Design a protein around this ligand. Structure first.
Ligand SMILES: *[C]C1(*)(*)(*)N(*)[C@@](*)(*)[C@](*)(*)C2(*)(*)(*)=C1(*)(*)(*)[N@@](*)(*)C1(*)(*)(*)=[C@@](*)(*)[C@](*)(*)=[C@](*)(*)[C@@](*)(*)=C12(*)(*)*
Length: 308
């Protein structure tokens, strides 16, 4: 297992997505930007900003939590191929979208059933229907240090799963009282959405079709599950960390599972991720993109097989 680091601006490149050109990638960073890597000999450019207030002088390269409400902080991004546009979920500006050329994003939704969003975290677009599925970590606590602390202390179970439909412009509540839903990924065939409940160490399966449509069921136990991203085979990669029996400390792993809950592949991450929580593992073009809040470079894994 080989690791590659790509030096990036700002800090904490946590989430990735890709467009039809498939040259490079997009990533969300701590200072409120969505940036685009253009290739090994042309670095990063700014792509988009959820916050309409974002500006270089005040927000570029900041990690001051006090500047977050103004600059924004995007937690996930999902490219819509049919419409050449990028969906965004931000901790301060909520569900947004930006067209192909980027720039400042258009805000789409900030509440459901009269209850404001507090910390949108994961997003995915159904490539066939253009319908957007996304999670809110809490209905009480935002991404401030004070908020994170309260979520932990009260074992906050006020997370939600929503859908947004661009043809109605309405958003609908699918699930409530989730236990820190930091990951959500639609099946290849659109029949279900898998949701990671970080504080309950599990993945649940929410049905979009079939006789159980509109309900969710337990799928598989995963320690401290984060983001979920589907690969081209239709399987799901999730970030995981497990406290080590005998240690102290965690062991970090990427875990690939199917829609029936079978564990298909387990990848212990190498340093520096090995003993740290991480955000996401996403398979694309034969590479594993690793999202984290704890580094200033993007991490990518590939296996070296030049001997067998
Ligand atoms: C799951 C992950 N991501 C989302 C959010 C979060 C996580 N974890 C935690 C802890 C505490 C608070 C919040 C959180």
């Amino acid at each position: 297992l080989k690791k590659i680091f790509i030096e990036s601006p700002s800090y904490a490149p946590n989430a990735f997505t890709f467009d039809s050109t498939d040259k490079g990638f997009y990533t969300s960073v701590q200072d409120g930007r969505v940036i685009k890597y253009e290739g090994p000999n042309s670095g990063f450019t700014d792509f988009a900003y959820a916050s309409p207030f974002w500006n270089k002088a005040f927000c570029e390269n900041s990690t001051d939590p006090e500047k977050r409400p103004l600059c924004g902080r995007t937690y996930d991004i999902s490219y819509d191929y049919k419409n050449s546009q990028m969906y965004i979920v931000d901790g301060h500006y909520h569900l947004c979208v930006v067209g192909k050329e980027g720039g400042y994003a258009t805000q789409l939704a900030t509440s459901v059933q009269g209850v404001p969003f507090k910390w949108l975290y994961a997003v995915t677009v159904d490539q066939r229907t253009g319908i957007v599925y996304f999670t809110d970590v809490s209905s009480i606590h935002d991404d401030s240090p004070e908020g994170v602390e309260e979520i932990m202390n009260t074992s906050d179970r006020t997370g939600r799963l929503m859908k947004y439909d661009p043809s109605t412009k309405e958003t609908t509540l699918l699930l409530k009282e989730l236990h820190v839903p930091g990951g959500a990924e639609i099946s290849a065939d659109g029949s279900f959405v898998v949701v990671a409940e970080f504080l309950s160490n599990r993945i649940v399966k929410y049905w979009l079709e079939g006789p159980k449509k509109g309900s969710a069921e337990f799928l598989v136990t995963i320690p401290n599950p984060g983001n979920i991203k589907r690969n081209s085979d239709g399987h799901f990669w999730v970030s995981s960390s497990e406290e080590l029996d005998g240690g102290q400390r965690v062991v970090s792993r990427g875990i690939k599972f199917d829609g029936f809950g079978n564990i298909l592949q387990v990848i212990p991450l190498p340093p520096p991720y090995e003993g740290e929580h991480f955000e996401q593992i996403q398979e694309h073009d034969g590479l594993l993109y690793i999202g984290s809040l704890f580094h200033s470079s993007v991490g990518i894994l590939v296996y070296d097989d030049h001997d067998n």
